[PDB]
Paper text:
PolD is the archaea-specific DNA polymerase that functions as the replicase in most of the organisms in Archaea except for Crenarchaeota. The PolD holoenzyme consists of two subunits, DP1 and DP2, which contain the catalytic sites of the 3′–5′ exonuclease and the 5′–3′ DNA polymerase, respectively. PCNA is the sliding clamp that enables high processivity of DNA polymerases and thus is an essential factor for replication. We obtained two structures, Form A and Form B, for the PolD-PCNA-DNA complex.
We successfully obtained a higher resolution map (6.9 Å) as shown in Fig. 1a of the Form A complex, consisting of PolD, PCNA, and primed DNA (25/35) (pri25EMssss and temp35EMssss). In the Form A map, which was obtained from the complex using the (25/35) DNA, the rod-shape density is clearly visualized as typical B-form DNA. Thus, we concluded that this form corresponds to the synthesis mode. The distance between the 3′-terminus of DNA and the polymerization active site (Asp965) of DP2 in our structure was about 13 Å, which is consistent with the reported 15 Å in P. abyssi PolD-DNA complex. While the orientation of the dsDNA in the reported PolD-DNA complex from P. abyssi causes a collision between DNA and the inner wall of the PCNA channel, the dsDNA of our Form A passes through the center of the channel vertically without interacting with the inner wall. This conformation is suitable for the sliding motion of the PCNA clamp during DNA replication. PolD covers the front face of PCNA and occupies the binding surfaces in the Form A complex.
Author numbering:
A (entry chain E), B (entry chain D): 1 to 249
C (entry chain B): 332 to 364, 372 to 382, 400 to 662, 677 to 1047, 1080 to 1198, 1204 to 1228
D (entry chain B): 8 to 249
Write the structure that this text describes.
Amino acid sequence: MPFEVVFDGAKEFADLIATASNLIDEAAFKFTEEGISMRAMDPSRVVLIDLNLPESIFSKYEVEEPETIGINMDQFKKILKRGKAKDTLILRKGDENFLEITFEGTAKRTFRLPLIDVEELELELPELPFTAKVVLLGEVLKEGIKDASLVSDAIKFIAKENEFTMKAEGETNEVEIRLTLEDEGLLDLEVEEETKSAYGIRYLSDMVKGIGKADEVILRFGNEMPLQMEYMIRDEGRLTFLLAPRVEE
Amino acid sequence: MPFEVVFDGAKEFADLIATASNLIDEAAFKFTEEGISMRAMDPSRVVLIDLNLPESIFSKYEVEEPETIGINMDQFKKILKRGKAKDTLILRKGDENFLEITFEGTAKRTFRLPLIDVEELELELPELPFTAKVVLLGEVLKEGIKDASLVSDAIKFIAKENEFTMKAEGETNEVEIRLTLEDEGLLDLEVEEETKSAYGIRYLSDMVKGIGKADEVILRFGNEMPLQMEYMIRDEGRLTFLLAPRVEE
Amino acid sequence: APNKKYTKEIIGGRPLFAEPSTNGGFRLRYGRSWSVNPATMLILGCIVTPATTVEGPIVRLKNGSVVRVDDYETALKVRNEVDEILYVGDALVNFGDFVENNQTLLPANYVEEWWVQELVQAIKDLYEVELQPFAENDREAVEEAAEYLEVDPDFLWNLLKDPLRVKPDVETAIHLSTVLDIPFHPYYTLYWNTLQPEEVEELQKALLGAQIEWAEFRKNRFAKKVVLENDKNIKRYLELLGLPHRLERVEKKRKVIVVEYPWSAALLTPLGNLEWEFKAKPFYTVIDIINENNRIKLRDRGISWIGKPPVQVLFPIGLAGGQSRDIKKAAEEGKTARVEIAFFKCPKCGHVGPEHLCPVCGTRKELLWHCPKCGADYPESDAKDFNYRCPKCDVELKPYAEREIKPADLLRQAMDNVKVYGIDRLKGVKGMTSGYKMAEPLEKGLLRVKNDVYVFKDGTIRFDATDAPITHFKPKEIGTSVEKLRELGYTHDFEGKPLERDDQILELKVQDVILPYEAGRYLLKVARFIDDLLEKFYGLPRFYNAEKMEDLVGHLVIGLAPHTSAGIIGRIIGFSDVLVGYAHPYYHAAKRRNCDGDEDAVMLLLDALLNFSKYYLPEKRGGKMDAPLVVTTRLDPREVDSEVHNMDVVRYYPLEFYKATYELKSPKEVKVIERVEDGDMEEKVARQLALAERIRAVDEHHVAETIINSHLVPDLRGNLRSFTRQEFRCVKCNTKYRRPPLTGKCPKCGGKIVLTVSKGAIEKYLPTAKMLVTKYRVKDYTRQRICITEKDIKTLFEKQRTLMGFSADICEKMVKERTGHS
Amino acid sequence: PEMKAYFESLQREIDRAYAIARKARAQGKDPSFDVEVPQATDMAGRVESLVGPPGVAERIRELVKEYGKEIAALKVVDEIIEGKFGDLGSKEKYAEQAVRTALAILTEGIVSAPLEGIADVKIKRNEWADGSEYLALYYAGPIRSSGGTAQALSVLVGDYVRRKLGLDRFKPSDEHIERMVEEVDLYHRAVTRLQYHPEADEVRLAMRNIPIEITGEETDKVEVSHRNVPGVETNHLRGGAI
DNA sequence: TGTCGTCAGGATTCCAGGCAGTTCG
DNA sequence: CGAACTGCCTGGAATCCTGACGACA
Ligand SMILES: [Zn+2]
Ligand SMILES: [Zn+2]
């Protein structure tokens, strides 16, 4: 139960947990000898967020025993609003339900909070054949989704051999973006067959606005199977969103 | 009663007037041969905001008769909000019930405004002997007061030898800030006993919205004594906030 | 009558949620002419009334022990660690209530006052000792009584002063009971009126199989403590008895209970220290069997079971103001206004305007008359000379006319009149209900706006307040000093003794006010506005000169209830700390209680004298009241005839009716009566917490309700009717209601048209019924649930689904169950 | 004892406030020159300020304090109908004033029902069956919560003034009783919940027992099945009379 | 006459990219 | 002699208390 994690500057982790809170409120961080893990489902059982951070991310990391703790997303969002980019985040926990967040600098800050428990059921996602993989930049996808957000909500991604297309249909508007290997927004392609699927972009737009511009993304999808967008944190941690498309035309 | 003030640093004057006005409306300006004094008053009658600006800071400070005039700086904040950093300001008053504001950086901007009349009695500050004198800058107190306001409603100040602790207490989460010699922003302090006081942020986070950075803020208080928070600019201009101790026993 | 009342109580609140442990009734304390202890309200549906000076209920905590609620501190301490509610407490209902429709007599109880009255009467007729009960006794009488009863004279004095406060020890109680064979002590008498003697036999067996230690006092072979094991018998009635015991766990046994004195003797001495043998006999209650197998007869204790728009100023703008109708906005825009208003005319200056006095000159302008049909104008003299008839148009001469005016430039007059320009938000009226549609002081309206107070459509300033009279009055509670009452005019107490003690129980004064801090602050703001206006209107010195909360105590205010055209004048003597208050039976009569409103509006005399005008009353229709036309202050309650009847009302217990209560007497016996007289979050949380506390009280055993369906089915029908009607309204074109046929946009306003969806309420009410049907299973409503869910589904026609679904739903479960059963 | 002196001091302060208000209103900056809220002397003053007439206070006090309030009000209404203090208009106006004064006296002058809730009272004849009479009681807004006791007392005083005037018994027609029971069931089932669920036979017995017919006013825009009923100006719902 | 939902709306603070001042081969 | 690296600061936008509306009992 007791642990201590010290890191000089955690604005990335702050905005990450802010996006997780905007996604869902009930979340439990499992602390194991390897690091931290979290898996948040959806109240409408349509979206799944997963994150893992090993012990090669923060500066100081001392854990006693692997367990599962819970932190309120509202109480955390009421905490990250004071995180300076040049601060030293220190998360301390003992045996009692007291969580300490410490910051060292021009004034020693220390906030104590109660620790409630979360009992969300965890189940391993079954393996599914992707048949479509691609690695792109985050800024291009973010600006495309922000340009196609106001016209409609169903954005259609089509992928063929060395070809990608992001389109936005409708009745009084149409948007189209082409992507090839010699373009300025595609890093690499691993397409297998001709796939095409339309997805909603509310949670998409929120989660891609929460992520910075220089970060990269890896999309895995198929014909009509759910999409998985993954990315890496400091080349050590992993974070993946997963959500199914719509059946309509 | 005619007088005139030609000043350079209109941006500094405007932000200082806004900071004096961010707290509360009432403000009696006293024009004297020794300088410009000001006593700002509130309906709560708990906080008195007395500033003094001498002739050394003013570029051209010409007086003919010392007089007091009561104004609310809320309606006057519209004109001083707009303005560059390097310019010339001229505040003139004559025998008529009008005030002339000349703005000249590179062109002419004259403003003839009416003179409102508010009736209030000047109350002298209680110069009680204290046992705690701590000097700092504005950023630390700004952060602490904003954290207390957005977290809870009660706060307790405890001063000991080279140790200034402020415990913001509420119901769920509890904040604490520590000030020691390691903080380069914190200056020396005169403290002989463990001075304890209690405050709230019901009317404290206002002036924070106007607190700058290059202004040395000294605070004098004792064991549950009225806090005299004076702050100096350019080693010549002074502005003190005298507040009664909102303590609970 | 009691069964009929219990059945008719189903018309309101969640039905079929009665506690099986304690019967559905409160205590009966006969008083001349309801009140429940606030401890039950803190531990927690009808009209409420506070009574804090009495005892409270008894419950059990999380530790397993049982304790009773006594005072506010302990109530607030244990108001969160409760496990199950056993008893409801001892609330007071009286006999002087004007109840009709053959309300039968509620069974009374053996009270301590009646008990000690019987005791003193018995000792008086036996040992020939005269005494005066219900008060402090005389020296010689109390001395001879103490000598006869082996008690202390000061203790007897304190007992006669207050028997509930000064409770005697059970040892001396049984000692004095052994001399007269009087019934048992009620306060230390459990409720046994709901147990079977066959189960009582097992109780005595478990008591014999337990541990017991004794202690005796003055030839009374009573006891000292009983240690029992909770597994020796069924703990159902052992917990339903409602006795404070102590629980112990680490004693070589899982559940151990211990009852010490003065709580173990209260259960052992009625059983005769387990000396005689108990037997089961039908048609004879446990108390009857006890009185049979004992030389002492007892009585019963628990037998009484009874059961927008927020307009501020009056400025007619109509559509010229649109929706907000901001005079500042209108002045900035510089637009006209077509109003049907009455204009004035000055004989000297000649200016025309809707104001009363002409501010340009020093006189007041007169009112001109105009025929709206024709184009003629005539003054009041010509109007009264021409018999109020115009030769051009044969219409009655009306003072007002319909024409255009420019408040944009007309506002400068009011500005220079008020001389103060402190205003942030201020709007005028939209419609006029009066026939003459007279004006309103714009200066007073601007002053009210700058004071930032509320107002109704009446035309004056009145604020709501809730009060409830009580039988006594205490300066300690009302917050007034002895010297303050002396300089007020009080020189003696309710018994003639001088006023020296702050805790002096007094009779309820007529002109006293227990009024909350919010009402006090509103009255302070009203007085500030009043002094400002009287210093800015005519230059009058401040009469009240009130600037603090305590300075208002002493002046006079006026109360008024709906359907009451007369304002009751009261004096400002008192205050309040709680959100409620108290009143007087004369200030609050039946016409002010059953008048479609319990609260009453308060006002100041100067406010009425300065802002009251009959022209503020509508022509034909009217609100909850007409107008505070006349003040009234004289309510002489038989001064020279029945002053004793008016004064002698508090703290009397009729021994005659207490003895003659179990004989099925007629409650309508006027002779005996005269003889004895002589959003969503708060509501949802409250409903869920009420259900939870009812479940804790009934020990997790309940059924479904009916008012949920009585709210849902009309909601569904109204929702369907609104969806089939679809009456729209243009946004800026606020008056022109657009037809349900869509024409794209409003032809007079090229924008969206606000529609009446009315679908957000049912979408939020559905989870309530879902959680209710998930917690409790009931029939006859799963059809309604599936119908409303499918209605929402096919009105929207859940378009996305993953490979792993399995959405848990008791609705789908019951649907599949019924499908398989079909 | 000293309570009389305390009330005298209270009325002295009230008179001081009244003199202050009069000195203020002496300038005349409002269309009003007299005191709008005067102090009542007794129930006689209350009923005189409510409906008047201004000067029957002496007779009211004499009758009440000499013979009891009930027969006092009875004789007062008798005198008002007979016109002892003079004439005030027509017989309909006399009956209206008598009913209003009687109701204000029996209610002690607290309820404004006869003041504004019941606007006018007229007598109308039956031009269909035999020429009997009905009270056209033009009501108003503030009558929907007039109070059950006040409504019963108004019915009593109406029957009393009808017996005084000597009118004929109205013949309850089939269409009249049908529309009455229709309005009753409509108000009970759709308009608003009722405090006492009535019965068809009971309301029929009541409508047959009322000697002269009663015709109220309009309440809401709800029609009936039998359109154009003789006697009523429209076919709306008389929920107020119900 | 009490309650409950929706909508827009303008005033507010927070975030981000352009204008400006500044130390590096 | 040019290029990143900040302050900062003002535009753009998300948030929200207030002011309209309709629904039931
Ligand atoms: Zn004039
Ligand atoms: Zn005419």
